[PDB]
């Protein structure tokens, strides 16, 4: 059944010239059939290097749209067109326009987990991995930041700059661990290092040894020799990590599952390659507009 499905997927992939890009939060079966697994930007950038012009993207809509923005002349298909980010969808163009009005000297820094429509209105895009570098390099000492309040406050702490978060209480449900969980693993594994996402609430960040994006997580065992790592993010990272460091132990801080990331399965992936749908299409003017704050991001980096 799974061999059945996987064999067919690996068959139709080669036969129809698709590259498969999976996000770190995908079920391990989909990570294993992917050509590259990574975070949002890493996958879009990799896609820019490829000679192939057909991409099957395994993640959520905004990420597939990011791939499309940076790779306009490539066919990008997703297996579940409803896979989306509810946090991102809470920030609106009306809210952006309201805050630019109130704070005209504050650049609009937009987190990558944001709608493409929102990107068109942003001054610069950022990721969890570069948000600190990006905001530090902007001239202004005050920024408008969205849609994640936690990442925004983390950026404030690290840059010393004033960070106006939008919308009200923008948060990712997957990363709302409680600090008690850290207290518990510390007693259970006294020599374990705890790594948590910057999207986590402040108490959780303050009690961890490391705060990092998924991409940063993947690099910490290259320099930290510890046997055991407690990982405070979506469960799919545990599989990525174990694969890259089979010599260490990776313990989820808690079971945390993104419902939308899990909408992608072997079955609907197979259907995607069969039908060559669903294609990610954006208006050309949306692409042209959203590219500006993304290119601005590359420039500051680098």
Ligand X SMILES: O=C(O)c1cccnc1C(=O)O
The binder of 127, among ligand SF4, Cl ion, ligand X, none, by C-beta within 5 to 8 A per type, is ligand X
Biggest alpha carbon distance in the chain?
58
Cβ-based nearer residue to ligand X, 214 or 264: 214
Residues that bind ligand X (CB under 6 A): 23, 39-41, 112-113, 127-128, 213-215
The span of 83-91, 181-189, 208-216, 243-251 binding ligand SF4 (CB under 6 A) equals 83-91
d(CA 40, CA 215): 10
User: CB count, 10 Å around CB of 108?
Assistant: 22
Among 30, 66, 134, 174, binds ligand SF4 (CB under 6 A): 174
| Number of helices (H), then strands (E), in the chain | 16, 12
Cβ-based nearer residue to ligand X, 31 or 213: 213
Shortest CB 172 distance to ligand SF4, Å: 3
| CB-nearest residue to Cl ion | 73
Cβ-based nearer residue to ligand SF4, 25 or 229: 25
Tokens of 247: 């010599």
DSSP-derived secondary structure letter, 249: E
Positions 103 through 132 that interact with ligand SF4 (CB under 6 A): 113
d(CA 150, CA 180): 18
Positions 86 through 105 that interact with ligand SF4 (CB under 6 A): 86-87
Shortest CB 214 distance to ligand X, Å: 3
Torsion of CA 231, 154, 210, 262, to 10 degrees: 20
Of all helices (H) and strands (E), which one includes residue 70? helix 61-70
Strands 124-126 and 142-146, sheet pairing? unpaired
Shortest CB 42 distance to Cl ion, Å: 18
126 is in an annotated binding site: no
Task: Give the chain's length.
Answer: 302
> Which residues contribute to the site for ligand SF4 (CB under 6 A)?
25, 60, 85-87, 113, 172-174, 234, 258, 260-261
């Amino acid at each position: 059944h799974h061999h059945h499905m996987v064999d067919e997927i690996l068959k139709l992939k080669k036969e129809k010239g698709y590259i498969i890009l999976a996000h770190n939060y995908q079920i391990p079966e989909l990570q294993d059939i992917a050509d590259f697994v990574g975070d949002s930007l890493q996958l879009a950038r990799k896609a820019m290097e490829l000679s192939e012009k057909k991409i099957l993207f395994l993640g959520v809509d905004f990420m597939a749209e990011l791939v499309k923005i940076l790779n306009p002349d490539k066919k990008v298909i997703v297996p579940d067109r409803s896979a989306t980010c509810p946090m991102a969808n809470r920030l609106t163009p009306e809210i952006i326009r309201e805050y630019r009005e109130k704070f005209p000297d504050a650049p609009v820094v937009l987190y990558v987990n944001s709608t493409s429509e929102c990107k068109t209105l942003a001054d610069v895009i950022c990721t969890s991995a570069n948000a600190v570098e990006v905001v530090k390099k902007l001239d202004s000492s005050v920024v408008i930041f969205g849609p994640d309040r936690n990442l925004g406050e983390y950026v404030a702490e690290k840059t010393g700059k004033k960070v106006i978060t939008i919308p009200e209480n923008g948060h990712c449900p997957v990363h709302q661990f409680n600090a008690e969980s850290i207290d518990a693993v510390r007693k259970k594994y006294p020599d374990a290092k705890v790594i948590v996402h910057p999207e986590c609430p402040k108490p959780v960040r303050d009690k961890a040894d490391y705060v990092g994006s998924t991409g940063q997580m993947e690099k910490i065992p290259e320099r930290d020799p510890s046997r055991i790592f407690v990982i405070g993010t979506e469960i799919g990272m545990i599989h990525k990590l174990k694969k890259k460091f089979p010599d260490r132990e990776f313990v989820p801080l808690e079971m945390a599952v993104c419902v939308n990331m899990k909408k992608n399965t072997l079955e609907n992936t197979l259907h995607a390659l069969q039908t060559e749908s669903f294609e990610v299409i954006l208006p050309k003017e949306v692409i042209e507009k959203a590219k500006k704050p993304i290119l601005r991001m590359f420039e500051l980096m680098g």
